[PDB]
């Protein structure tokens, strides 16, 4: 429940420490954790809110000009001097102008012309700093069992901040899922400014928001801002040797939108800003989880399929059943079978054990299960009343392993070491792989990692030819680097 | 550009494709994609649905270009002569008729 | 401005085609409008500024 139709969910089946299992949570999908004798839990990361951010260096992306003025002195004097040249709210430009004996001063050298114009701003955009402290994560988890397809004690919500990295989700009757997370560690926020222009917000690398050629204030503005640059938005063009003209460039808000590419969008409610794409890593202490359905008597009245048995995207099968009798809370018998002569359990039943908890007249419940690849029968019931359904699955185990490798490769391309931490109960091969991946990833990010989908595809093809024809061990070195870059790209 | 009242439409993982009636209007930009659907959202099946979104387009201002034939363009030449003119009549264009 | 041809034809912006008469028609509303989608469960339409 809550992760049936997500289409980007992965199963963390397995727990070999009898205890905590590491899991990396992403905004895209969610994680179903199934243990040996413990109920299947679906865990999802929902929203990342940021609060009380600190304004830093707002730029001015639209200028307005004002009362221009100018002066010129004859070709043999000092220099032209507007009194508004000692005002830090005016842009002043000095040049040489053809002058003499026609303009009024007898000599024929070049004059000196100064022009000053007052600067005004409209529509500035501002950036703000995100400290590692004071950003909150909200994780929603739910449990399988008795919830029909449509205080709950089967769902819980956990708030996690760097001030409280660990919390327990109290599932009434199932115990409590302890949950430790690395919130400071999970997405670097020590390089990301929160950027707003006009009711639109982004996450921006703190190196793209310092190499910007636009008039910039510093910090918050008490009153009318003082902008230091006075250029790169005001253009002093020159007439054919006799005049100066001052123009402003228009509103800049379409170039910034295209300068932003690969920057994450966000949204804002009041002093808080919700990011909808993040990455968090949690260890799941599932040792206070029980089963709410052992020591129950088998339900023996009848069962009716209420919708149909449906197939999720990953192969599993969801079934929604209605119970006719009134036996109180009682256990549901269900299995995947072939050869209905000898009912032999084939496949695996994802839900832990399906127990009906509401007994008034008719109850509804939803379970799901992982059937084998051939034809099979969903068998729900005990004797002479076991309604069954015919169900067919598509692909052999080889295709499943191939898709698993593809998913692992994509997760690696997205995360790196934290991807190495996804299913890490924790051994020595895992930690060694994570270490070597850390070293190689640091080197690769240092050398490459300044390109976007085209520079790196070009360098990939180039070095691919190079390693193909160089005839050394550098053949293997290149071809490996090329596999890296080209998959990093084609993942998309 | 400026945008206006959006709308959208979705379909079952196995139905046709979404269709807003505002796709037959040349004032709306419309885009079609695939969305995860099923059993929570409203139809029993689990594949990818089809979602269409449309929005009305309006332009506050636009730049316009115009063509120039090499005819119907005029040049204006000013010429003057030396001799008797005093220095005042160098940058003075008030009466050249007489 | 004075502008060359082939710079006033290779421009990726919504363009009418001459006599603006009644209700305006734009050949392309494409790229003046960005159709993103959320994590597989939404769609969002924004304009570039």
């Amino acid at each position, epitope marked *: 429940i809550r992760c049936i139709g997500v289409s980007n969910r992965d199963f963390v089946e397995g727990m070999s420490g009898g205890t905590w299992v590491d899991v990396v949570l992403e905004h895209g999908g969610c994680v179903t954790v199934m243990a040996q004798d413990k109920p299947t839990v679906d865990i999802e990361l929902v929203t990342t809110t940021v609060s009380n951010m600190a304004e830093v260096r707002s730029y001015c992306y639209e200028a307005s000009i004002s009362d221009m003025a100018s002066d010129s002195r004859c070709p043999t004097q000092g220099e032209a001097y507007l009194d508004k040249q000692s005002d830090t709210q005016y842009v002043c430009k000095r040049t040489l102008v053809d002058r003499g004996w026609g303009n009024g001063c007898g000599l024929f050298g070049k004059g000196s012309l100064v022009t000053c114009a007052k600067f005004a701003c409209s529509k500035k955009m501002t950036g703000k700093s995100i400290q590692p402290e004071n950003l909150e994560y909200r994780i929603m988890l739910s449990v399988h069992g008795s919830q029909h397809s*449509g205080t709950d004690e089967n769902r819980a919500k956990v708030e996690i901040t760097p001030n409280s990295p660990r919390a327990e989700a109290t599932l009434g009757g199932f115990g409590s899922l302890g949950l430790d997370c690395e919130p400071r560690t999970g997405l670097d926020f020590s390089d990301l400014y929160y950027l707003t222009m006009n009711n639109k917000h982004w996450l921006v690398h703190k190196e793209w928001f310092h190499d910007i050629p636009l008039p910039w204030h510093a910090g918050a503005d008490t009153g009318t801002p003082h902008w230091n640059n006075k250029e790169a938005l005001v253009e002093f063009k020159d007439a054919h040797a006799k005049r100066q003209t001052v123009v402003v460039l228009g509103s800049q808000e379409g170039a910034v939108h295209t300068a932003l590419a690969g920057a994450l969008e966000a949204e804002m409610d009041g002093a808080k800003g919700r990011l909808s794409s993040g990455h968090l890593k949690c260890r799941l202490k599932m040792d206070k989880l029980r089963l709410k359905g052992v020591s129950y008597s088998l339900c023996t009245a009848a069962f009716t399929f209420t919708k149909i048995p449906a197939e999720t995207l990953h192969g599993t099968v969801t079934v929604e059943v209605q119970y006719a009798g009134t036996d109180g809370p009682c256990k549901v018998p269900a299995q995947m079978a072939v050869d209905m002569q000898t009912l032999t359990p084939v496949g695996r039943l994802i839900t832990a054990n399906p127990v009906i908890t509401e007994s008034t007249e008719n109850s509804k419940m939803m379970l799901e299960l992982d059937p084998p690849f051939g034809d099979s029968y969903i068998v729900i019931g005990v004797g002479e009343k076991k309604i069954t359904h015919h169900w067919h699955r598509s692909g052999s185990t080889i295709g499943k392993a191939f898709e698993a490798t593809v998913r692992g490769a994509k997760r690696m391309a997205v995360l790196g070491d934290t991807a190495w931490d996804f299913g890490s109960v924790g051994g020595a091969l895992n930690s060694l792989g994570k270490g070597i991946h850390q070293i190689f990833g640091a080197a690769f990010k240092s050398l490459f990692g300044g390109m976007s989908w085209f520079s790196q595809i070009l360098i990939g093809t180039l070095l691919m030819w190079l390693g193909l024809n160089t005839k050394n061990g550098s053949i293997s070195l290149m071809c490996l680097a090329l596999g890296g870059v080209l998959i990093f790209l084609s993942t998309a | 550009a400026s945008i206006s009242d959006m709308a959208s439409d979705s379909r079952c993982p196995t139905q046709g494709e979404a269709y807003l009636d505002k796709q037959s209007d040349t004032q709306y930009v419309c885009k079609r994609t695939l969305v995860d659907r099923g059993w*929570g959202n409203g139809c029993g099946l689990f594949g990818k649905g089809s979602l269409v979104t449309c929005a009305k387009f309006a332009c506050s201002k636009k730049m316009t270009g115009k063509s120039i034939q090499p005819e119907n363009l005029e040049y204006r030449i000013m010429l003057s002569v030396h001799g008797s003119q005093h220095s005042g009549m160098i940058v003075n264009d008030t009466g050249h008729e007489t | 401005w004075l502008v060359h041809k082939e710079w006033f034809h290779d421009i990726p912006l919504p363009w009418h085609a001459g006599a603006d008469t009644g209700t305006p028609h734009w050949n392309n509303k494409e790229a003046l409008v960005e159709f993103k989608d959320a994590h597989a469960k939404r769609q969002t339409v924004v304009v570039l500024g």
Partner: antibody
Amino acid sequence: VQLVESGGGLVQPGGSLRLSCSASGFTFSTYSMHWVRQAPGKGLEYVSAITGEGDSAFYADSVKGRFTISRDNSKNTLYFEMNSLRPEDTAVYYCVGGYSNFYYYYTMDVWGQGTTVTVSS
Amino acid sequence: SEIVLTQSPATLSLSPGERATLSCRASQSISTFLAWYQHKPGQAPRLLIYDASTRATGVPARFSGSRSGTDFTLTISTLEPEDFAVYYCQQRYNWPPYTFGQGTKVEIK
């Protein structure tokens, strides 16, 4: 959890009216809102809807073009600006609200008391 | 075009204590997404059943719902005096063109 409707009144054909529906007791932003009307001697008719976030809106063919639904999540208010009214729009209007994580879908709803709109010549 | 719902009898005359049965027929396949509402004059319509069998919060147990293909049934076992009202079915399938049935009135016989 309640919805208080207001703004209904008698108006001439072709008149413009604005109906309001104030929500209380829940997170207004997470609820998809709908307008359902009932003419005298007729069954309930589902005419309009808007998502929780205000992104998208739906109008039934019987009202498509003349009526405009909107919402303000800060003031917790749903608005149904109905223009070009006709005598066929004389009915009791109810605003309903349902918890939605998808554009308009909802399971358990909440209804207001309704407001009468009379369009007589 | 749009999905339409048909409520068979449009009027049900029964006495307090009898068993009431109302049917709703859909024009096309809707899996279980049917809702039953009770409407009394002078009161807002009250949601009784959603998902065609699940009783809303606080609804008494005497109301039951059943489905078979496109035919949905609302059953009232023990008719009560306050149970005499109008009853509507509403289709909740996949998008808003959502519609109600013409309604069936439960009248005292």
